[model samples]
Target: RDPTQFEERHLKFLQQLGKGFGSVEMCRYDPLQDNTGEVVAVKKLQHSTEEHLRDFEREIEILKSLQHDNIVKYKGVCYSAGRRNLKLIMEYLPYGSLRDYLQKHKERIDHIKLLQYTSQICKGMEYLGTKRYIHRDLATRNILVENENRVKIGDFGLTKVLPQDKEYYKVKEPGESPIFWYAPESLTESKFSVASDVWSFGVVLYELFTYIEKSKSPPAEFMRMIGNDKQGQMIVFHLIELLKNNGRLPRPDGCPDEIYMIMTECWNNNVNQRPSFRDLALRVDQIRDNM
Candidate 1:
């Protein structure tokens, strides 16, 4: 086999970083072809048929196309001597994931830091949107932290590309129902667009603001709709109202009213009313400057 695609001997697996769908391992590689004494993160997907390989290849292509300070850098893809291990190599971020960092220090994160993280996320998505890519699954978990406070958006496994002027893409099959983080249109018609992604960004802000993984029940705007139905109706009615109205995610405790306002704009039910990443970034900058 050619050595360029990947040389099995060059890679040295250090330790398992975290656990989830695919196995992610911290590793070191020989500097002869890359950086010296540099650490990296490699994610391995299970080996499968040619079709599966094709999908991985497509993701790799997307990774290669991305280049931004706030977007994860793609090193390359390689597999073990018979394709037993298909790995995606990425720049190592010593501080673990943004989700982990936020959770560990949520109580201590000051307003400036929050604004920084939010701004960085918006900048990253702004870049991706300019490239005509939509990240269907954007979350704190998919973002990586480095150099103490710098954050980069990673995980393009669920990314989709826009074709021409198509405003939405419908690729619905049964899967996890992430309604809390989704725009109403996304779930109702299986539609996905930049606007839908904006909605998810609002939810990510909530995660950053709370540093908690659990869902937050928004302000009880629909409590009156509960009527005289079963007590359980309270839950369903609240959810349905969230879908119908331009409902917002639960405001974080002690969160600034300005930040919450931005989140509200992102949650606007009318897709056109939602701010683009560029506008979001500007508003965040203004907030940060004022603070």
Candidate 2:
């Protein structure tokens, strides 16, 4: 394959480290680096038939601008200012994505571990929330675990950096299908906002805690992560369905109770009552201190 400056740097970095992502480096993070050791991941973005490269280009700007321990690193771009297919340079992580990890242990994970994972996840979301970015389509699949206790979020494809004054669901689109981690507003109302991401974070917490077909009661500690509302009982049922068959503890015992509260609060049907990422982050930090 042809190598751009970014591609070159990517190959060199992996070579120096004695690692590789095989022939198709879809998520290597670095495409190339000049001999100078400057590196970047090359994202191969395909233009949608209906939408031009605008969204993808926006992703380029957002990813490159954002730098965080939990957020994936965006390095640079090698696309025609007017062209569709392009290479995106970013920081590469070899341990693979949380999506990959979840696939391996989709059965037998626990609530405590899930809460731990979600707390860390909230830390990242809080960071992004402060920067005014919305991580749409968050799920177990989008999170990456490159090292033990280290998480990197990906799939900037659907992410948007919204203006604060803009009303939630102010943007328009229709006929979208259901996404597992989608919050009630996002699913039924298209009311996506920082709060929406928090709800998705809760579902992610569920995935992390339980590894079977689903998790049981999900531990009171993890339940603390969600918000409450009129329709909340149904969501609790959904959570309970995962636990109906579980014979373990009623609540996720190992995690702190506060996180469990936050989890449900994030999922509350009353969107107005949902906590902000800043608050969520504080809770995560608080629980972490307790841990």
Candidate 3:
């Protein structure tokens, strides 16, 4: 049986916010409260198949029990019969996602804020790893901003529970696996692991500093942020072709040398050479505190 599927009377869908990989809709939901000043985010799923629906239900079940300050809280599930839309109630984050914040702030975010943001994500990743959860998608876009200093990792629809005996999981029948953020083995063998996540984290650091993903042209706004020049574009293009051959991630222009070295470690050809998220947090904290 499904969890509490709130009827239309109890829930009000305020606005359509954004779209993710799936044809999912982000919306604001009012619980029809009476002067308590309560609001929650609604993630509406209108899947065409029962299999997708089942997976979403499983996601809800997993999220209901999982609790962590760095992770998004799953309030409950909702159902809209007429439209056949299933919704997940989540904690509303007015500040939106970390990606949007970084884009909005652009060059405004100084070294201190950037390091803090990166460290916060590492903390969240480390927390998830302890619970044997593999966040297949660990980009800045999936991270939500609670405020200037606080953030929480959200979007668990693509998240998976790591098997007990296996260290690496195969990600077959894939859809949204970004090649730019993955290790060589992840694409070659369709494998996933903590190491693969570290690879993605390295790319995330690039995005945090450069305001764009690999092999893609940043908009005019982003070009100005990283300095309107051909050098940044060349670096991303070089990395794309380089990834196929040597499988290495070069340091972006604005990144400090020490941080670049850490990013290099994450993009190691040997998965075992990568440091754990705990180690990354410590490393980031050390760099952040140094004058």
Candidate 4:
């Protein structure tokens, strides 16, 4: 089959729509990460696209290896860092990030809806984890939803890979991160293991259970705080508050105690005590079976 191609303007147009969501001012283009039509969706990343780059090419190498319904599929990659860089071009998700969806539909959200949504997330995450990839920043904002209400993990730009017997490096500093949603280990260590990803997932799960209200954030503030080393430790503080405010947490209309229990387990500061992806996935499955 001949591959469909679009003009640069088409993708550029997508970039403008990156964060124009949550608002119905259709022409205003308030994408998930938007300002005006001219702004780029994402800019220079932590890893150099030049010679100093990690063989772990940011979005390019990562996108090529992944494809699934629950996970966003990579469309194409563009490289301007040099002639050889594969700057990734991904399929634009219609519904935007879970962040936008939650904020857009905050008042209407509930547990069962979150369960259905997260079940898809679990499947995608289980796939990646089983294959030895750990999504260091698995959170609501990074998880993109489509028009059909299908969920997919979009921002793989921060994922960490671990092959058996291979020394997977720790989560690096000086990069963008979803701070308020980070799992415990994500903030402390350099490495993001399968377990840590589960912790991150828990944070995602929490946000999924909570808001449908659009508590607006400053786009400029987000861009500034993301991925800086000084902000990394802030993850731990966020989770502490999470446990402290458990009563206010969102769960299904009648979710079992295990839901909150799992959140507690996921946030256990001792990384050793955290649940593994496999375990978390199984638990989510059980939640589905019983619910």
| Native-referenced Cα lDDT, model 1 | 0.76
For 36-119, candidate 2 gives per-residue lDDT tens digits of: 554344455333432535666677777777778888776556544443355566666666667566657654444445545666
Off by over 4 Å in 3: 1-5, 21-37, 80-85, 213-241, 247-249
* Residue ranges of candidate 1 with Cα displaced over 4 Å: 1-5, 19-21, 31-37, 47-51, 81-85, 213-241
Best by the TM-score measure: 1
lDDT of 1 by residue, 1-291 (tens): 442355546777788887543567888877475646557788776545676566667777898899999998887777766645467888888888888887787768787997898999899999999888988888888888986668999788777888787977776673544555667777667788999999899878877777664443322322333333426435554566656864445678888899888888888888999998999999999988998
Give the per-residue lDDT of model 3 (tens digit) for 168-206.
Answer: 788768775655566767767778888888888876777
Error of 4 at 89 (Å): 2.4
Query: For model 1, what is the alpha-carbon lDDT of residue 10?
Result: 77
TM-score (all chains, Cα) for each model:
0.84, 0.67, 0.82, 0.68
Best candidate (score: lDDT): 1
Candidate 1 backbone collisions, by pair: none
lDDT value, residue 62 of candidate 2: 78
lDDT of each: 0.76, 0.58, 0.72, 0.58
